[PDB]
């Protein structure tokens, strides 16, 4: 009559997320000067190490080393006690230019269709459902918020012993018949901390200040299991502790496994990379379908060929909850959304330095003004055009 | 009455796959000397560059640079004209390396998925299965000189049409294939050879129709390639490595990780569980999710979905799985004989769906016991 489902998130101090944030800070710095820049910025962080590699073609003049160090400092890695310290980190720049063989497919006036072609082949999924106020699956939505809360309390000093690296995991119970959340089964929360605080003090504060204020009280019961720093002390973390790379948190970045993923990473990529722009568009489409009341769950897949503007495929699944057929939904989507690469960029105003905030705590489910793919401004037109 | 679904794969020369293969070649070299080693070997490749970083605990003595160069050589990067070559690139070793029970706790939290279905002989989804085979065929004809103008880097993408009622594949709608090439061959000659000698020998003829669209090297040129054209990193092909989008993913990479790491061992176990449930005729579609907490042995969650195809309830299946499989981290290692150098081959053309002798998670040796224990 019920089943379990689990998602996780990590803080901005997790080493993979450090790499994502460095990649998107560099992207933002470039786009602030050159909105049309071609950016494919990959980052690897390790002990004392920040390698910047990939392909960038831009008129922007950005001090990549300074931007990387300032990003690492803003995350919290700015003191000798943490091991990994921006001031004591080697930043090495290895960027190439964008390959001209790729550029001639993407550039307008040079495509097989002379339109802006997709930056790559690939497949992308979007998803929305009615489980949370921002139309996200429950477990990833609240896992992100646990990690945001950890960072909030650290950065304003209310829990001054918190350190940057942390992880959270939620196992939730669903009703097999209704698909509705019944209760929270397990909360895992691990946080880095100053060595002077005891594990007992830490657990009390994590419960009072992080777990209880974030999760819905009605879903925490006598059966809920709390696993706080379950292997004990967590003093060293970040890239002193383990290696981080761009694009190694793609499930955290999206839907926490509540929907399939096409494989493409987001951070460090300008919007001509459909890995980013089309995944954002798919979230926008699915969210507006659910907000229009046309389905209570909606999943979309698209795909592209490098150097081709029209998607090679589109498919929509409402899991039996759609008020109209999925064929009619695809027709509505194609009428109200331009999923060609240039059409997406125009639809979502993507040639702007709006990406740094997306690189931790999830790309989806936060109704921040930067995140145009979270607007539900097409829902009314979809509902009307469906005949509802 | 119909819907579309798309998956992709990449060749062993794709820069992300180069990184995966270097990571797992180093893992194998370590495991051959020290089966109990802890390995978390990450690789980044770019123009003239192979960075090796991560954490290793072992008694093995491995020449990591030589292993990396040998792996790059085997893949086919043997000229600096390509911007990346085995003899000439810089290899830099940054590992944090140190010298150095069924209820041992997991080494991390995390979630993992497995999947199986009846669409292909090895119980894989159609689109990923044949996307892999397209890329294996590209590499085969390059290496044996049948198409000597091929270069190592390549990608393929299949869009398939499914019947909305029966769920069966009806036809192939679009084949995308991009392959790096010697500048001397025209696009017209390249396109014809890819279609006639790579694509058509691999895909089922009855699924290729006059409506099938072939998009070959659609930018018009693919001479620059490899890590120069596109930086590669370990763990950036996790959907190619698994089910091509036909099932969700927990997020963790496989390559460079020793089998104590549940990101890899539990995903392999979930494939093993799902494939045996299908092989036993208990379902035609089966998806499983597990998760772990750091320091805890038994998974924090397990769930199974047969998408209405199951012959017993999913509750009954979960009970069967707990009785017939040991999903504790050390129990998986024993179940699948994982403390051996068996991983280098997994790092290109998919971890699932090939019944190689190394791939113990592809054995259906529990199907009969599950079919009997289910009462069927
Ligand atoms: C298109 S690149 C990703 C974007 C790239 N980093 C950039 O700077 O725009 C990803 C993969 O596409 C393939 N690729 C590279 N050049 C290509 C070309 N000219 N045509 C088709 N595929 C290409 C290679 O497999 C490469 O690893
Ligand atoms: N003592 C610890 N307890 C819980 N989580 C940790 C601890 N140390 C590190 N982590 C987290 O776990 C991630 C994966 O690496 P590992 O520390 O090996 O599990 C790290 O990047 C940290 O986010
Ligand atoms: Mg990681
Ligand atoms: Mg991709
Ligand atoms: Mg890549
Ligand atoms: Mg992991």
Curated annotation (Swiss-Prot), chain A:
Pathway: Amino-acid biosynthesis; S-adenosyl-L-methionine biosynthesis; S-adenosyl-L-methionine from L-methionine: step 1/1. Its EC number is 2.5.1.6. Binds 2 divalent ions per subunit. Binds 1 potassium ion per subunit. One of its GO terms (biological process) is one-carbon metabolic process. ATP binds at residues 14, 165-167, 233-234, 242, 248-249, 265, 269. Its main location: cytoplasm. The keyword Ribosomal protein does not apply. GO terms for molecular function: ATP binding; magnesium ion binding; methionine adenosyltransferase activity. The keyword Chloroplast does not apply. It is found in: Cytoplasm. Residues 98-108 are annotated as: Flexible loop. K(+) binds at residue 42. One of its GO terms (cellular component) is cytoplasm. It catalyses: L-methionine + ATP + H2O = S-adenosyl-L-methionine + phosphate + diphosphate. Its cofactor is Mg(2+); K(+). Mg(2+) binds at residue 16. L-methionine binds at residues 55, 98, 242, 273. Keywords: ATP-binding, Cytoplasm, Magnesium, Metal-binding, Nucleotide-binding, One-carbon metabolism, Potassium, Transferase. It holds the Pfam family S-AdoMet_synt_M. HAMAP family: S_AdoMet_synth1. Catalyzes the formation of S-adenosylmethionine (AdoMet) from methionine and ATP. The overall synthetic reaction is composed of two sequential steps, AdoMet formation and the subsequent tripolyphosphate hydrolysis which occurs prior to release of AdoMet from the enzyme. Homotetramer; dimer of dimers. This is S-adenosylmethionine synthase. The lineage of its organism: Bacteria, Pseudomonadati, Pseudomonadota, Betaproteobacteria, Neisseriales. The gene is metK.
